């Protein structure tokens, strides 16, 4: 996250920190995600497409730091890693950039809600906040596009939704953004998501509920003028999410 504020997991308790184990046994961060039910984390397919084997991944819930353990965290293996079969990218745009991770602890349990772990509600079919709405994004992504290190403490910031009309202007992204995506950014272009924040939530209050409106997906640079974050539009993926999470 560029700009914004350091936070703690209790302020974003649906935030999932996803890591991959390497031959040798070193573990590095991959991407963010969101807990949408006790056994289910949603994230972005681009985060996994290079290494699509579920056995490589670890998911932490209730974790506030990147490379350090925090009290109240819980660790899960990935029982099912579901990538969108129609994922594609161009130079910039990612389509169908949505992934599901079924989580299970070694003791065979799904998440249990606590002061540091809560699910986030999904929106109703095609239900989104009106543009101009202020939303939150959170992650362990770079704090400046030019940095090589990632913050060790979780960050969050506020960004406002941008209309399709404005986002589809040529000096923005033009026809790169579809109805299956949402744009969001700071009016002054000072705060944004960045590398490392992919797969994490764009959370909005909608019909008076904290809702997962978007998933951090793509954008040109980070915190550049007229170049908003682009987010997978969750309310337009309810059938995909439904048909892949049945019990």
């Amino acid at each position: 996250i560029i700009g914004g504020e350091f936070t703690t997991i209790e302020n974003q308790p649906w935030f999932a920190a996803i890591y991959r184990r390497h031959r040798g046994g070193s573990v590095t961060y991959v991407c963010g995600g969101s807990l949408i039910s006790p056994c289910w984390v949603i994230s972005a397919t681009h985060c996994f497409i290079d290494y699509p084997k579920k056995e490589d991944y670890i998911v932490y819930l209730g974790r506030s730091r990147l490379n350090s353990n925090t009290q109240g965290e819980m660790k899960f293996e990935v029982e099912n890693l579901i990538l969108h079969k129609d994922y594609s990218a161009d130079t910039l745009a990612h389509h169908n950039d949505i992934a599901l991770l079924k989580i299970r602890s070694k003791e065979g349990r799904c998440a249990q809600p606590s002061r540091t772990i809560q699910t986030i509600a999904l929106p109703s079919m095609y239900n989104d906040p009106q543009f101009g709405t202020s939303c939150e994004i959170t992650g362990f992504g770079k704090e400046q596009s030019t940095d090589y290190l990632y913050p060790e403490q979780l960050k969050m910031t506020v960004v406002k939704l941008i209309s399709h009309r404005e986002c589809q202007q040529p000096h923005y992204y033009g026809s790169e953004v579809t109805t299956k995506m949402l744009c969001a950014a700071d009016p002054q272009w000072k705060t944004d998501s960045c590398q490392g924040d992919s797969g994490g939530p764009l959370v909005c209050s909608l019909q008076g509920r904290m809702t997962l409106t978007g998933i951090v997906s793509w954008g040109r640079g980070c915190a550049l003028k007229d170049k908003p974050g682009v987010y997978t539009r969750v309310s337009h993926f309810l059938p995909w999410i439904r048909s892949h999470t049945k019990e």
């Binding site: 390497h22 070193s26 590095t28 961060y29 991959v30 991407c31 681009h46 985060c47 497409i49 290079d50 990218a89 990612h94 992504g141 770079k142 596009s145 990632y150 998501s193 960045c194 590398q195 490392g196 924040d197 992919s198 797969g199 951090v216 793509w218 954008g219 040109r220 640079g221 980070c222 974050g229």
Partner: peptide, 16 residues
């Protein structure tokens, strides 16, 4: 760029 890259296809990443 290497096997340890974080979010290598994310915004501003080598393959983003």
């Amino acid at each position: 760029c290497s096997r340890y890259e974080v979010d290598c296809r994310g915004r501003g990443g080598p393959c983003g």
